[PDB]
Amino acid sequence: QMYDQLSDPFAGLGAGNIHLGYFDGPDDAATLAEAADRLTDQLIARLPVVRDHRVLDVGCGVGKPALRLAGDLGVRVVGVSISEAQIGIANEAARAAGLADRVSFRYADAMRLPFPDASFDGVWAMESLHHMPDRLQALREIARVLRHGGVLSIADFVQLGPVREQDEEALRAFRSGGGVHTLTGIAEYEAEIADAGLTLTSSSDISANVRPSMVRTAEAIRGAADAFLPLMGEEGLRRLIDNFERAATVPQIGYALFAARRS
């Protein structure tokens, strides 16, 4: 519901990216849209696939990360989402870049993947698995469609520890507004990957590199009030902004990059 409504405006705050950014710290002079493309690059380093490999983009957004994958690495990409609106935009972006024969997007719920077993050489889940009610079932479906020796690269949120009473309400606003159905610590995350049948190969805590994205995204929204206001209204937009601004006050909100292999 959330996505179909506001995808247009958010996609555009990050050029075509619907995910956060990677900075060298708060005093970094990279644009939000630049920091978003830097995050795509950081996850590409965790996905050792080569030309002609077939990759599944779980939670594809409007397809810019997927298209970047096909351009840099030469992989065929099938992206899945649950927003029919996003899929139509993503497939046209692929037609626009002349990659329709390499990159396609279809409807699919990551918890019941509509693909045969071992049909993909790699899986790519950028900032999407926290929308899953049962994250373990999504990882189990991911391992199933991965061929033996296939690789997985996850970018996602994590909780670095328990939140103090004074920040309880800011966490709750972050989880309800951001659609964060699953949020766990790194230990609990690494354990699920193993329980799904995947052998962990990388684990990067990049929380400090991503935390600025919270504050800077709020500033971009204010600058984009013209695009957001008609779709929400002053009261709805002020709360959206506030959700981000409060989320930045929770230091236990982190971010991790994982890489795994199928046995």
Ligand X SMILES: O=C1NC(=O)c2c1c1c3ccccc3[nH]c1c1c2c2ccccc2n1[C@@H]1O[C@H](CO)[C@@H](O)[C@H](O)[C@H]1O
Contact residues: ligand SAH, CB under 6 A: 3, 17-19, 59-61, 64-65, 80-83, 86, 109-111, 126-128, 131-132
Is 181 assigned a ligand-binding role in the annotation? no
Question: Cβ 166 to ligand SAH, closest distance in Å?
Answer: 30
Name the residue whose CB lies closest to ligand X.
177
Name which of 63 and 168 has its Cβ closer to ligand SAH: 63
Identify residues 121-140 at the interface with ligand X (CB under 6 A).
127
Secondary structure (DSSP) of the chain: -HHHHHHHHHHHHTTT--S----SSTT----HHHHHHHHHHHHHTT----TT-EEEEES-TTSHHHHHHHHHH--EEEEEES-HHHHHHHHHHHHHTT-TTTEEEEE--TTS--S-TT-EEEEEEES-GGG-SSHHHHHHHHHHHEEEEEEEEEEEEEE-SPPPGGGHHHHHHHHHHTT------HHHHHHHHHHTTEEEEEEEE-HHHHHHHHHHHHHHHHHTHHHHHHHH-HHHHHHHHHHHHHHTT-TTEEEEEEEEEE-
Is 253 assigned a ligand-binding role in the annotation? no
Stretch that binds ligand X, among 12-20, 114-122, 132-140, 254-262 (CB under 6 A): 12-20
Residue from 243, 250, 260, 262 touching ligand X (CB under 6 A): that is 243
Does 18 interact with ligand X (rule: CB under 6 A)? yes
Q: Which residues bind ligand X (CB under 6 A)?
A: 2-3, 6-7, 10, 18-20, 127, 174, 177-178, 240, 243-244, 247
